[PDB]
């Protein structure tokens, strides 16, 4: 019998590492179905904000206009998605954009040659002014009521150092990109995670004792922190299983072709969530759980 | 022609890394693997993206239709 | 010894500053040498 209590008694979380960008925790005694559901919801259905509808006034740059629009829409934005709501479809496109769900990112740049251009200067950082357009140049501007709401939030790209376009003197860019809420399953630019994946904990079943120099090489097959030599009795024991990446270098040697089995525990996942800069991986996982729960709840309460 | 904002396979941003990679490679005798390690790229999906970018926009820019040559 | 190498620094250098001396990639020109040499042999070389 499986019950909610019989699952709560055995399930556990071991947050091995944490950071504002990358988490690495463990889900134990949970089903591969639910762990995979969390992973997929996390990588696709967790909302985020990225520019969608660009507006271009001039683009004399070498970069094609649509290529620049794609690059601009790609860049992550250090915006909490919960600060702005969702956009409409049936509403007129002149009126679908409110001050509660849209972020405007102007970018006005004009490359001009540096009059004090040194002789023998090859690096363009001296020969031209504003030759390189960086994502820092995307300058958020408040609209309507945004002044008294997003004041403390310095809306900037989650990376201000991503390169947008390389210019030449005379060439100009002048655009305004509207940002809205979206999800990863729609377009890969809304995915709030650089990655989100797990792996079952490797299992190393040593059947016959490995003693002497044989255990010394048997340890060298695995990563350095996986197998250890016992102090007193010269042997091999599994020191840290998580540290092992399953490469099966042992199986290439016949002396270990019958002394070890490389199994794998089927209920012990090792998640690793890297935020794209928009949020933090602990909150990404929290919202993945909340999305799965709200999805099951909406299915439950939806009339049949 | 110009460095992509996000790595195709995963999504790890490699577009804020091209100048850093070039600087690491030219200022010191850093090999490409070491530079890609120090730049935050440990999976080969990210590593090849900056190991194998051509940056053809340099050759592209040298034909300016708005400058005397 | 490494068998090959991404000459990324050289590639960026040749993108930024094309050589003013004899062009790089010498073997890319012996490839076309047939057509150019054929045309140049009718209005140059011995006997006019």
């Amino acid at each position: 019998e499986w019950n909610v209590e019989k699952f709560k008694k055995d399930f556990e979380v071991n947050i091995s590492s944490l950071d504002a960008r990358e988490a690495n925790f463990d889900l134990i005694n949970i089903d591969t179905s639910i762990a995979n559901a969390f992973r997929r919801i996390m990588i696709s259905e967790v909302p985020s904000v990225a520019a969608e509808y660009v507006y271009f006034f001039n683009n004399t740059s070498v970069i094609q206009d649509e290529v620049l629009a794609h690059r601009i829409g790609l860049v992550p934005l250090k915006v909490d998605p919960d600060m702005l709501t969702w956009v409409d479809s049936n509403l007129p496109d002149d009126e679908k954009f409110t001050d509660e769900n849209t972020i405007v990112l102007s970018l006005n740049v004009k490359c001009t040659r540096n009059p004090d251009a040194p002789k023998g200067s090859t690096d363009p950082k001296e020969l031209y002014n504003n030759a390189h357009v960086y994502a820092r140049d995307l300058k958020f501007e408040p609209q309507g009521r945004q002044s008294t709401t997003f004041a403390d939030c310095p809306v900037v790209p989650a990376d201000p150092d991503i390169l947008l376009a390389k210019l030449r003197p005379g060439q100009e860019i002048s655009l305004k990109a509207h940002c809205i809420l979206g999800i990863g399953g729609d377009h890969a630019k809304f995915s709030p995670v650089s990655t989100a994946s797990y792996r079952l904990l490797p299992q190393i079943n040593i059947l016959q004792p490995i003693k002497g120099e044989s255990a010394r090489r048997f340890q060298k097959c695995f990563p350095p922190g996986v197998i250890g030599i016992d102090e007193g009795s010269d042997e091999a024991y599994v020191k840290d299983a998580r540290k092992d990446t399953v490469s099966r270098e042992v199986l290439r040697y016949e002396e270990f072709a019958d002394k070890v089995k490389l199994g794998r525990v089927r209920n012990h996942f090792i998640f690793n969530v890297e935020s794209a800069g928009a949020m933090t991986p602990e909150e990404i996982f929290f919202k993945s759980v909340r999305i799965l729960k709200n999805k099951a709840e909406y299915l439950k309460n939806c009339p049949i | 022609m110009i460095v992509p904002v996000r790595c195709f396979s995963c999504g790890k941003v490699v577009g804020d890394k091209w100048e850093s990679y070039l600087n690491l490679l030219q200022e010191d005798e850093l090999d490409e693997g070491t530079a890609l390690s120090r730049l935050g790229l440990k999976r080969y999906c990210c590593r090849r993206m900056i190991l194998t970018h051509v940056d053809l926009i340099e050759k592209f820019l040298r034909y300016n239709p708005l400058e005397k040559r | 010894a490494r068998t090959a190498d991404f000459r990324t620094l050289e590639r960026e250098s040749r993108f930024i500053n094309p050589p003013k001396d004899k062009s790089a990639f010498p073997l890319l020109q012996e490839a076309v040498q047939p057509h150019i040499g054929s045309f140049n042999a009718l209005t140059e070389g011995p006997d006019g």
Partner: peptide
Amino acid sequence: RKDVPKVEGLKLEHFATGY
């Protein structure tokens, strides 16, 4: 014929997640 030259000084690149 000498064999293909070996790229020497090679270290361990793949470390498990969290490592």
